[PDB]
A paper describes a structure:
We used an enzyme activity assay to assess the effect of tenovins on [name] enzymatic activity. This assay revealed that a number of tenovin analogues are capable of inhibiting [name] (IC50 shown in Fig. 1B and Fig. S2). We finally obtained a crystal structure of tenovin 6 co-crystallized with [name]. This crystal structure demonstrated that the tenovins bind in the same pocket as our previously published compound, HZ05 (16) as well as brequinar and teriflunomide. Based on the crystal structure of tenovin 6 co-crystallized with [name], we decided to model the potential interactions of the tenovins with [name] to examine the energetic favorability of the interaction. Our structural models were constructed using the apo-structure of [name] and refined using extensive molecular dynamics (MD) simulations. The models suggest that tenovin 1 possesses the same predicted interaction at Gln-46 as tenovin 6 and that the reversed amide present in tenovin 39, tenovin 39OH, tenovin 50, and tenovin 50OH is not favored. Now it has been established that tenovin 6 has two additional mechanisms of action, [name] inhibition and blockage of uridine uptake, along with the previously established targets SirT1 and SirT2 (11) as well as blockage of autophagic flux.
Numbering used by the authors: 33 to 395
Amino acid sequence: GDERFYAEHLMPTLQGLLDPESAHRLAVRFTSLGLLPRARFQDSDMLEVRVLGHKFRNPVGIAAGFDKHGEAVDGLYKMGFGFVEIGSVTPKPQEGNPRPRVFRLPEDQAVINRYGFNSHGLSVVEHRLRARQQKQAKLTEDGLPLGVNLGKNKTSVDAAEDYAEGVRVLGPLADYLVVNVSSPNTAGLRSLQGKAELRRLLTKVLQERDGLRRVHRPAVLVKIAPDLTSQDKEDIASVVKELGIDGLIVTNTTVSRPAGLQGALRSETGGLSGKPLRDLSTQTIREMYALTQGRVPIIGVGGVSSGQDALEKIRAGASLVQLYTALTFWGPPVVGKVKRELEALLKEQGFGGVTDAIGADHR
Ligand SMILES: CN(C)CCCCC(=O)Nc1ccc(NC(=S)NC(=O)c2ccc(C(C)(C)C)cc2)cc1
Ligand SMILES: Cc1cc2nc3c(=O)[nH]c(=O)nc-3n(C[C@H](O)[C@H](O)[C@H](O)COP(=O)(O)O)c2cc1C
Ligand SMILES: CCCCCCCCCC[N+](C)(C)[O-]
Ligand SMILES: O=C1C[C@@H](C(=O)O)NC(=O)N1
Ligand SMILES: [Cl-]
């Protein structure tokens, strides 16, 4: 009924009438004022997950990039997400790339973007989160945690120092931080996934995190690309275990263009998201789980539009999942749809809950 309206009428009219950047801004705005259904799906106990030092009422989060500046957090919980990740936030404000910088590939259920870390900056986000800090503390306690994704400024001379500043400023306000070393849209950034660079960077990040007062001390995750070599994945796994990194977000967008893309805009520069990324992301989860012996929580992201999509990532090793791109095509009903289908599939496959399914394919 209501998922059939947004998918076939509203989203085709929103997206047909406005350029994707405009549409996204309007969506942030609407979401932030809480103009959504109100959201009817009541989360089953089957969907609760305990990971990263927190309870998650359900395992479906909004991926980084939808709410870059932390403006819509409460509306995103109201949409039925189990957890919200904001960002990426850069130390200083910066504008990002010139427009157009986001492209829909409706025939692929995909998006390409080259935003380039358009960010209001740490200070503005810090103030926005402080204004609701206690409210968030109650949400977290009730099983609705908040992640903050950190990036780096385009002209920064010292990448590690940018991330460290991010830890110092937003770490105290976050349940988890993400060291986003996987945007395809900032020159040299993905180099920070290499072994020696990554170890030096994360050492410094963890030190900064460790220097925060205990109730303000977040988990630290690293978000990785789907385009890594085997060598690069081996090396990340090694560093993450050596340093005690709390988890991985797997994956960012791809700079690949899988054969079969039909959208006219398929050769635009940027990162590809949505359904052509799905199985590349799933396979990256699968390998990172195996290389970390199932001991390092993974948040699985890339092309999730359904309960099956979510369960494939969980079974491959994700403790939690996120989605973004599906919202472009299905709108807010997709969240309840993913949850309901995931619950039914867990029951069908004989799992007592999401926790029992995590990594099941490896057992
Ligand atoms: C007639 N109306 C519009 C009001 C009707 C009821 C409320 C409502 O529609 N709310 C609402 C809330 C959110 C949305 N859309 C969402 S959540 N997302 C997007 O439209 C969107 C997401 C991502 C992108 C890019 C940047 C990836 C392309 C673009 C749009 C649409 C409608
Ligand atoms: C328009 C857009 C902007 C994004 N911005 C960011 C960001 O700032 N930081 C980040 O770590 N990931 C960013 N992502 C990546 C998503 O968080 C996600 O990793 C990727 O889009 C795969 O999930 P999806 O297929 O469900 O969209 C962005 C994605 C899109 C589509
Ligand atoms: C709020 C003061 C800082 C503004 C700096 C410019 C950041 C551009 C972010 C882009 N946009 C507003 C479209 O999301
Ligand atoms: O991490 C990121 C950053 C983003 C951008 O261009 O800002 N685009 C992405 O696809 N991933
Ligand atoms: Cl082409």
